[PDB]
Amino acid sequence: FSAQEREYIRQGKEATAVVDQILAQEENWKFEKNNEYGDTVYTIEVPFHGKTFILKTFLPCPAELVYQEVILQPERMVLWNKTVTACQILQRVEDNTLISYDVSAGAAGGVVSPRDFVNVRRIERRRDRYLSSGIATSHSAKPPTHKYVRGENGPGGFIVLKSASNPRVCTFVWILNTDLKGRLPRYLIHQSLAATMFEFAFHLRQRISELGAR
């Protein structure tokens, strides 16, 4: 591996370690907001990157289906997930480290403009869960441009937890630490992120339903 490939690999492992640490501290998550579907958003304060949002949703399908639809098919997720405007895999390192270009849709109400991102992700399959953990990185094919504000994710990820007791249900967790930059006050950004998390959950639920109807 080149030095650059090794740095991408390390970044994915580091992001995975933080995701694991957050999941191991669930008793310390602070409730923030929920909705009428029981989607629940929490926060946790993490060193350096600070405040991190966590979405937890119970879904009526096997964990493997969510792993396929969210974690293994990020480009296809653009089609059904309106919070995702675009996704392009720029580069793969080994089988489980990927560098992507990602564009997030403007806030449902237009106050927060779309951001684009460059991310490294590490995908791990475990006995009882699937993880896609990642963090901002740089890639020469996608410099910042005037088309978008270039946001920067801290450590976070998508996690699907298998149910030991009922194979027909699973738990979906989105850990989201991000800096959208710009000059809006933080509280407005935080409102927009929570809203985006609920919208994500809505599209994921609809996708699982559509797949279960066929």
Numbering used by the authors: 231 to 444
Question: Can you list sentences taken from the study reporting this PDB entry?
Answer:
The lutein-binding function of StARD3 resides within the C-terminal START domain comprising residues 216–444, hereafter referred to as StARD3LBD. The most remarkable structural feature characteristic of StARD3 and StARD1 is a large (∼1000 Å3) solvent-filled cavity.
A crystal structure of the lutein-binding domain of human StARD3 (StAR-related lipid-transfer protein 3; also known as MLN64) has been refined to 1.74 Å resolution. Electron-density maps did not reveal any larger molecules located inside the cavity. A segment of four residues (Gly336, Ala337, Ala338 and Gly339) was associated with weaker-than-average electron density along two alternative chain paths, suggesting that the Ω1 loop is capable of movement just outside portal 1. The new structure includes additional solvent molecules and alternate conformations for several residues, including Arg351, which is located within the cavity, and residues Gly336–Gly339, which are part of the omega loop found just outside the cavity entrance.
